[PDB]
Every structure is written in C-alpha cells, then in structure tokens.
Symmetry: D3
Subunit: 110 residues, 6 copies
C-alpha cells in the first residue's frame, strides 16, 4: 500500500486544463465532452484526497496538525466547486489546497 | 442530490453478515469468495461515509458538532479494520459508528 | 445476503431530484452536469432493481406473485424512460413502480 | 443506441467455465485465489449483459410472443449465480445452455 | 482464462457509430448530451478491448509474423479517440475498418 | 491533456509493496486480501501504461523511438506476470520497464 498526493494533483491538474480549454471553444459537442471529462476527473481527485485522509493519516497526525481535518474537507469542497464551474480559478484554488496536504504528507513521511 | 447514511449501513451490514458466514464454513473456495465480497462491500461503505462528510456536511455542522470530523475518520478506520478481519465484532463496531453519524445526520435535517 | 429496495429507491429519488433541479436552473453547464449525474444514478437504480429480482426473489415468490416478473421489467423500463427525460413525473413513475416492489419484498420478509 | 448482442453474455460465461476448468489443473493457492477473483467479476458481468437484454432490448410484444422469456432470463441469472459459487465446470455449462436459449429467441426477433 | 474475441471491441465501436448516426436525426439538447455521454463511455470500452487483445492475447511470435500489428493497434486506438471527439459517422466507420483488420489477423492466429 | 507515467509507477509500486508484504505474513485471510488488492492495482497500472501509448505518444515519437511499441507491450506483459505472482522481483521488472517509458516520456517533454 503506497500513498502519494500526486494522484490527487494529477487529476486536479486535468480539471484545470479542461476548464482552460472550455474558454477557447464555442462548439456544443466539445463543451459537453469537456464537462463529462471534468466531472469524472474531479470525482477521482476527490477519491484520492479521501483515501489519504481515511487510510494514510493516523491519530498522531491529527494531533500534530489540528487543522488537517478541516483542510481536507475544504479541499473536497474546493474540488466540488471546480466540478461545477468552467472558471480556471476554481480549479487552481483546489490545487492550492492539495499543495497544503502534499506539504503535510511529506512532513509525516520524514 | 439525495443523501442517506442507510447506504453506508446496508453495505456495512453485508460486511458483518459475510463475517458471520465465514465462521460456519471451512471450504477454501467459499472463504475466498466471502473475502472478495467483504473487500468490495467494505470499500463501498467507506465511499458512502466519505461522500456524506465531503458533500452533505457543511461548515455549520462541523461547528455545531466539533467531534464530527473525528467521528467520520474513526468510522472509516473501523470499516478498514472490519475489511481486514473475519471477526463479526469488528463489523458490529463499524455499524455502531455509522449509527452515531446517522443520528447526527437526521438532527441536521430537522 | 442483505437486501433492501431502499438502495433502488434512494438512487431513483436522486434521479427525480436532479429532474426537479433541471426545471428551475437554465444554465447550459448545469444542465449538462445534471444529465451526466442523472444517467449514472438511473443506471445504479436499474442495477439494484435487477439484483433483487435475480438474487433475492426465489421460485416460491414468483409462484405467489405471478405479475412480479412483468412488474420488474416495467420498473426497469420506466427507469430507462426517466434516464432519457427531464420531466420529474417520469422519475415519479419509476418510484411508484419501486414502491410496488418494496411492498412485495416486505411481505416476503414476514 | 440499439446495438445489442447475446455474444457479450456468452463470452463472459465462457470465461467463467474456462476458469472453472483451469482450477482443476493447478493446485497453487495463489492461482486458486486469482481464479476465484476473476470468476466473480466475469460472472457478474455475464449477469449484467443478460439483464440488459431483458430490460433494454426485449420489448413488450416479445413477452407476449414468448411467455417463457421472463422465467428463462431469471433461471439464466440464477444459473450464473450458481456458477459464481462453484468450481465445477458443469455449472458453467448450465449457464451457457440457458444463454443459448436466450440467443435463439434473440435472433428470431431480429428476423420477424 | 484464455477466452478472447474482437467482437467485444467491434460491438462497442458499432455502438459509437450508431450513436453518431442518431445525433444527426434528433436535435433535442438533452438527447445530444445523453448521446455524448454514452459515446464517451462506449468509445473508452472499445479502446479497453482492443488494448486487451494486444497485451493479453497476442504473444511475441505474433508480432514477428505480423510486424505491422503494433502500429495497426495504435492506429485503431487513435481512430477510436477521433470517433470519441466527433459526431460524424465516418469517424466511427474508420475505427470499425481498423478493428476489421485486427479481427482478420486474430482468426489467422486461431488457425495456425 | 495532462499525462504523467507517475500514475503507472505508483500503482506498480503498490503491486511490488503488496508482494513484499505477502512474503512476511503467513495468514490465509491476509494472503487472499492481498491477492485481490494486487489484481486491481496491476490492472490499473496496465490501464495507465496503455493510455500513454494510445493518447500521449504520437507518430513522430514512434519514428524517433522504433522500439517504443514493443517496450510498451513488454511492460504490459511484465505487469500481467506480476499480477500472477507473489515474487517482488516480478513487480520490480514491471517497474524497470515503466522507468524506460518514463525516460522516453520526459525526453519528449523537452
């Protein structure tokens, strides 16, 4: 059982990249396809963030970082906001939150 | 978007029912099949508990119930313990934790 | 095994709830996202209805309730009609059919 | 869409029977377990395809023309569930026999 | 297991082309969206089946006997990706044409 | 689109880690659970390797690296061999092959 927040980051990066491409194309088919892919990719990023909190992070980590529980919840809600938006900024906000989890993850691995 | 912890409870009930049936049969094939089904069912219960915490529960719920973040994490770890055990008691412990989430869920719906 | 038509009902209620929301929100992005969600929720509802018919209901139940076979086929088709529609009444027709299966299910539990 | 074929159900059921046959040859505990995992997934996929034909392809007049179809499909699904829980190739064959009966009715509905 | 068949790839690719054809008839925004969702899922499943044949069925001497197979399979997958992004039935047909070429090589490996 | 062989590497590392754990824990229940986990992790690794070959790598990359087609087929087969084995060396062979794809991938990003 190997863990890495890179899995959440890669899927969230895809969400932002899809949002950016939606602003440069008018086509109803492309807009629909991009919305389908974004939905799937965002749900996968949420799954990876959830698994880290559920299976990797243990009681001493929640004691050492009392803000971790809320950070992970805020990340999931940021990803949910990105899932329902075409705005690349919401995709970036989700990535900013994942970056904070990534920092904490590696501090617990040292 | 409808939510109900019954989805987590039904899948966790299946996990306990599978654990109980493992004590009454010696057969290597049945033991293997039951282990495969238990793994799948436990992961589904974990997914349903995760979705409630991620998508249903909002900031005022975490403020009103300061123990909710840790209750949900303890539930996931209890389900993970049940996933790796043949003991029906570990399956019951997971159900006891889901019952506490179910009580809080309905209090937020009133 | 542990069975309950509540699994089918919850997914079917989600389909109707998505249909209700589509009626009051004109946004093309939301309309597309709602269509993706409705498609998978209806497919999940169909899975649950199918499982009860194949795995729970045995030959004595089909003998006592001769219309059960056709009721389940009608329910599945009503769910496919709901999957292809934005109208809440189609989601309600599928829920009315699940309510008929739910009634029969509990009579066999007594 | 409109593109359905019992071959999807048959291929997955053939895989179930093929796995049951391979289990009798190799006694290795790891292979026995891997085979059980694959059989479980393949059997549920065979069940999905059979159920899809019954609900999505077959229409109401097909059930009037073939009053046995409802019961035949249920027996196929139960036969597949029996195969899922067994290492015996005979159970996998029973599921294939039932699928062969659905296949016959399918191609008749394609002609008239 | 040992039970493989290009029909699985073909049926899913036929569903992709059938959806592309249905999109030209009904202009309803809800149907256009539902069709796009189904096409995306069906196209990825067609890609999975083609990739499985290439890695799990086809063995090393098959690539010596058919030096074009590696490139043919990649072109099939790319043709399917093109169909996934288009409403045009001609793209779905191109994917089926490539699958027909894989199908021919498959049945030759079953004979000798 | 956003691609990275890290997705294939992480799943492949999980396969090797499960193989390592199977070597030091005799329990039949754990052995079965580990086999289920290893089976899906290897299948996910195969999916990722296949996606890079079909969706990322284009005709100029196959022209510049003539052995890339066979390298990817060998990697997928090594992963299937790892899926059917408890030996960590098979998991490592699949990781060595992914490392060769990773090297080529980054050279095309420059």
């Amino acid at each position: 059982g190997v863990y890495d927040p890179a899995q959440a980051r890669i899927e969230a990066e895809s969400v932002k990249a899809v949002q950016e491409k939606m602003a440069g194309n008018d086509d109803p088919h492309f807009q629909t396809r991009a919305t389908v892919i974004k939905e799937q990719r965002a749900e996968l990023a949420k799954h990876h963030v959830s698994v880290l909190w559920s299976d990797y992070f243990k009681p001493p980590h929640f004691e050492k970082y009392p803000e971790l529980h809320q950070l992970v919840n805020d990340t999931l809600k940021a990803m949910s906001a990105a899932k329902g938006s075409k705005d690349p900024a919401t995709g970036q906000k989700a990535l900013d939150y994942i970056a904070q989890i990534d920092k904490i993850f590696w501090e617990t691995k040292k």
